[PDB]
Amino acid sequence: MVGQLSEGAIAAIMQKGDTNIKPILQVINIRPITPPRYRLLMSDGLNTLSSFMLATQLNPLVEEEQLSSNCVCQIHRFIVNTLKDGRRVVILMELEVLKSAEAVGVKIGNPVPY
Amino acid sequence: SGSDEELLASLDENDELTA
């Protein structure tokens, strides 16, 4: 099932910074860090990365459990911001939920933190 | 991958310059 995810997308965003991709990722978990702002640990099957933040327009997907731990989604619009210390933050502006947490049922593979 | 603070500071690049 790691072949269901865009393996290498996390490294690509962190290195090349390009936003012209529509990666398919698994949500590992979600945490409010504040009108709540949600921080997501995402997986591309190879790596995990927690510097993801959801646009607040998408908050209802979290609050109604459609975007939830182990669900699989496809990002359709995101922005990259690069911090003074070299860290890159991804803001998820638009996405599609492709498969519910309940339909996936497990964390896919054994991704390691980027 | 970043503190919550610098993640939130990243929403406002002027704040990120001096965080």
Residue numbers in the entry:
A (entry chain A): 1 to 34, 39 to 118
B (entry chain B): 7 to 8, 243 to 259
Text taken from the publication that reported this structure:
In the RPA70N–RMI1 complex structure, RMI1 residues 243-259 form two short α helixes with a β turn in the middle. The overall arrangement is similar to the complex of RPA70N–BLMp1 with the N-terminal helix in the groove and the C-terminal helix binding to a neighboring RPA70Nb. RMI1 L247 of the N-terminal helix fits into a hydrophobic pocket at the bottom of the RPA70N groove. RMI1 L248 and L251 interact with the hydrophobic side chains of RPA70N I33, M57 and the aliphatic part of R41. RMI1 D244 and E246 are stabilized by electrostatic interactions with RPA70N R31, R43 and R91. The folded-back C-terminal helix also interacts with RPA70N K88 by forming several hydrogen bonds. RMI1 N254 inserts into the side pocket of a neighboring RPA70Nb and forms a few hydrogen bonds with N29b and R31b side chains. D252 also interacts with S54b and R43b, further strengthening the interaction. Superposition of the two structures showed that BLMp1 F160 and RMI1 N254 point in the same direction but not at the exact same location, indicating that the second RPA70N molecule is able to adjust to different peptide sequences for binding. ITC titration showed that the RMI1 peptide binds to RPA70N with a KD of around 14.5 μM, mutation of N254 reduced the affinity between RMI1 and RPA70N to around 25.6 μM.
The heterotrimeric Replication protein A (RPA) is the ubiquitous eukaryotic single-stranded DNA (ssDNA) binding protein and participates in nearly all aspects of DNA metabolism, especially DNA damage response. The N-terminal OB domain of the RPA70 subunit (RPA70N) is a major protein-protein interaction element for RPA and binds to more than 20 partner proteins. The RPA70N domain adopts an OB fold with a five-stranded anti-parallel beta-barrel but has very weak ssDNA affinity. Its primary role is to mediate protein–protein interaction with its basic and hydrophobic groove and a side pocket, as first shown by a series of studies of RPA70N interacting with p53.
